[PDB]
């Protein structure tokens, strides 16, 4: 009826009070005894060229060698980052691709974008020619992110304020996750693939479990759209970069803000966020044409990655941590070590 | 070095040959983004310019051997501050207005696309659509144009351009006053990098001419001749 607004406000006030009671003192008083990381220098070991338009997303393969990249020219290019050798160059049905993924087995590769559909291509097939194997449709808004659980199912997040879990062989939606008010911009899958997180563009992040399918936890600390999200290596935390030129860190059990990576000189928002092998380095992409390398604990911007002539769009660290890759809007992929 | 000899020749060389083959095709086409409200009649424009040539619709048309791909966004939510960044490097943006309450929203939308960070340097072709409806409405007399915009009351014809067809000054005055509002919002900011080309609404030739002007202006800017 008309009395539900005040009851919901009281419930949210109770949530705020319970969160406040769970906080004892400022975090800066606990991590001030740790050794500062120092200063990080990265240099471009190799730059992968060949894309025409701006690169919008890219994903490392399970092996630390192969890596797929999606560009708005309509191309999905697979590189062997060791020798800068291209392996496949798949043309796309729709040139407006906003996300791409690499299957954990390396057999399949997913893509999607403004056409609201997710395309699954098979790499290791007869005659060695890449052909489309599945076209999952059903999302209303533009498909913003997609991540493989295995060769059988893939999780997608679209701009219609929804996420979904698919079924490649059947082609239908096994389950759908709703609750976000703005468009979901990025999703990150836990290492166990039992839960994932969605950073929608409503200054809110949500945690879902794929087996049942309701929002377990909701975190609201940012003040603008969340553009990127990624799990901590242990799976018990995650970092969200937003459009207010801030990164933040969340812990599921704590259910609170932990770290707030920001600086006065930083003006443009965050485009991509990824962690490192140990979780001691958070790499973030910015509209200022460069990436930054924060410390998870110290939170003082240890390193800077400069050399991109346009906006940095995609970021990704391999599973073994031996390299990082940055794809920018100047149609360039850069490998750093 | 023989294990990665064929693994390089068969893959990288052929893929680069294909990439060079389709790069010239990509560069030889002009990508346009079609914008407009649900009552702007942009679909009629699409059909009109497509007959003689789910999340997004593509309309490939070519005028005197120049290829144009026009993208009309459909089956999308109203919140469009996010996917609008995709059209960063389109050659032009087509804006269609139903100039016939309704004009304030269209003016604000054009203002918003004008000042966006990612659309700062991309010019816009303005289509003041539905001219016959505007003429009939202004000649009708029941609908007053000066109450939605009091500035029209103290307005005079710009006299820089003339109405070629035989029509009374009232319709010309209203039709140029709406264009004046749009052009004032356009020229308030955004100087040098991008411009706006207004047309009262064939359209294929208009789009071709404005794209030619845009490309020539950009090329002359690269030579510091403008």
């Amino acid at each position: 009826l008309d009395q539900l607004r005040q009851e919901a406000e009281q419930l949210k006030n109770q949530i705020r009070d319970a969160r406040k009671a769970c906080a004892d003192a400022t975090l800066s008083q606990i991590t001030n005894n740790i050794d500062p990381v120092g200063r990080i220098q990265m240099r471009t070991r190799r730059t992968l060229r060949g894309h025409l338009a701006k690169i919008y997303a890219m994903h490392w393969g399970t092996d630390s060698r192969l890596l797929v990249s999606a560009s708005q020219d309509g191309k999905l290019i697979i590189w062997d980052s060791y020798t800068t050798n291209k392996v496949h160059a798949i043309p796309l049905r729709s040139s407006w691709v906003m996300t791409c993924a690499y299957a954990p087995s390396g057999n399949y590769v997913a893509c999607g974008g403004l056409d609201n559909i997710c395309s699954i291509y098979n790499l290791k097939t007869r005659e060695g020619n890449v052909r489309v194997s599945r076209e999952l449709a059903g999302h209303t808004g533009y498909l913003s992110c997609c991540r493989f659980l295995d060769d059988n199912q893939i999780v997608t997040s679209s701009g219609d304020t929804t996420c979904a879990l698919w079924d490649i062989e059947t082609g239908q939606q096994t389950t759908t996750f709703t609750g976000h008010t703005g468009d979901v911009m990025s999703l990150s899958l836990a290492p166990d693939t039992r839960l994932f997180v969605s950073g929608a563009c409503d200054a809110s992040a949500k945690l879902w479990d794929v087996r049942e399918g309701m929002c377990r936890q909701t975190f609201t600390g940012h003040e603008s759209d969340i553009n990127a999200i990624c799990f901590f290596p242990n799976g018990n935390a995650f970092a969200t970069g937003s459009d207010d030129a801030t990164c933040r860190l969340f812990d599921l059990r704590a259910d609170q803000e932990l770290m707030t990576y920001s600086h006065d000189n930083i003006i443009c928002g965050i485009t991509s966020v990824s962690f490192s092998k140990s979780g001691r380095l958070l790499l973030a992409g910015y509209d200022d044409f460069n990436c930054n390398v924060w410390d998870a604990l110290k939170a003082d911007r240890a390193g800077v990655l400069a050399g991109h002539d346009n906006r940095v769009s995609c970021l990704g660290v391999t599973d073994d941590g031996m390299a990082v890759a940055t794809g920018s809007w100047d149609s360039f992929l850069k490998i750093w070590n | 070095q023989r294990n990665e000899e064929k693994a390089q020749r068969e893959a990288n060389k052929k893929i680069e040959k294909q990439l060079q083959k389709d790069k010239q095709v990509y560069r030889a086409t002009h990508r346009l983004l079609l914008l407009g409200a649900g009552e702007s009649g942009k679909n009629t424009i699409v059909k009109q310019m497509r007959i003689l040539h789910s999340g997004i619709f593509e309309t490939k048309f070519q005028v005197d051997k120049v290829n144009f791909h026009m993208f009309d966004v459909g089956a999308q939510r109203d919140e469009r501050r996010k996917w609008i960044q995709c059209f960063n490097d389109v050659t032009a943006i087509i804006f269609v207005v139903a100039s016939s309450n309704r004009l304030q929203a269209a003016l604000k939308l054009f203002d918003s696309i004008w000042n966006n960070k990612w659309l700062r340097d991309t010019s816009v072709i303005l289509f003041l659509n539905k001219q016959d409806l505007l003429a009939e409405k202004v000649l009708a007399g029941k609908s007053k144009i000066e109450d939605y915009f009091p500035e029209f009351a103290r307005y005079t014809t710009p006299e820089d351009a003339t109405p070629e067809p035989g029509e009374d000054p009232r319709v010309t005055r209203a039709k140029y006053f709406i264009r004046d509002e749009f052009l004032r919002i356009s020229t308030a900011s955004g100087d040098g990098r991008h411009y706006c080309y207004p047309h009262f609404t064939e359209n294929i030739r208009r789009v071709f001419n404005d794209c030619r002007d845009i490309i020539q202006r950009m090329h002359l800017r690269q030579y510091e001749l403008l």
Partner: nanobody
Amino acid sequence: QVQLQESGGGLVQPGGSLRLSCAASGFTFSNYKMNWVRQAPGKGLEWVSDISQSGASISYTGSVKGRFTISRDNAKNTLYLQMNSLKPEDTAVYYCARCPAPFTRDCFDVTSTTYAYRGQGTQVTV
């Protein structure tokens, strides 16, 4: 979470005067551009007025071009719209609206049907 809450407005005769003040919480007010939107019965959202980053550049619609006063107070963290010479057609529900991004002079989806950083609205009836 972001939170905008506006002072209400009671029923007044045509030509009356009121005041709609909305207070903000959860963000740096001084770093954002704030607009007004109103929803009339049987009508969609329509933007009314706006305030620049520093509070200098202002703009109105034709209907309220010379009837309403728009202002913002950073210290009190509020934005006010003082209404003068009201009309029966101004009866609507008023929401303060926020630019989705800081540091920018323009933004979209302020008048959207499901915009996130919009207030609950006050019923101004004439």
